[PDB]
Amino acid sequence: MVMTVRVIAPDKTVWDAPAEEVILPSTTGQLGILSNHAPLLTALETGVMRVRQDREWVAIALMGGFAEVENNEVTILVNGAERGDTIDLEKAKAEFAAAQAALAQAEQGESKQAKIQATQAFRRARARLQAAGGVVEI
């Protein structure tokens, strides 16, 4: 009758609440899974997601992780979870700076594993960090 989404981390379990439709940015750009959906596995990157139980909606910031839906069972194995209470101004300035130096350093003779992943990770983290409700107006 309805879908059941649940988040999980490599350090422990987050929770498992119901849902009628989950919409969030995915590889292709758009990802819309429902209860009637079939059992399939997918991948997702850092960023916040929106959940619709019926008439209301909730926002949860989830970093890079894997998602898999099946029989109203969505397993989100993310490395980091946030209930929107992770907004930190100092975090945004630290993320942008840490990334700017991280990238420049990577090419200067440092850990240059993934330039796009490193820049997208920090950028996304900071973007969602404040977007969670840290800054609305100056």
UniProtKB/Swiss-Prot annotation:
SUPFAM superfamilies: Epsilon subunit of F1F0-ATP synthase N-terminal domain (SSF51344). Keywords: ATP synthesis, CF(1), Hydrogen ion transport, Ion transport, Membrane, Thylakoid, Transport. It is found in: Cellular thylakoid membrane. GO terms for cellular component: plasma membrane-derived thylakoid membrane; proton-transporting ATP synthase complex. Its main location: membrane. Produces ATP from ADP in the presence of a proton gradient across the membrane. The complex from the organism is particularly stable to disruption and remains functional after 6 hours at 55 degrees Celsius. F-type ATPases have 2 components, CF(1) - the catalytic core - and CF(0) - the membrane proton channel. CF(1) has five subunits: alpha(3), beta(3), gamma(1), delta(1), epsilon(1). CF(0) has four main subunits: a(1), b(1), b'(1) and c(9-12). This is ATP synthase epsilon chain. It comes from Thermosynechococcus vestitus (strain NIES-2133 / IAM M-273 / BP-1).
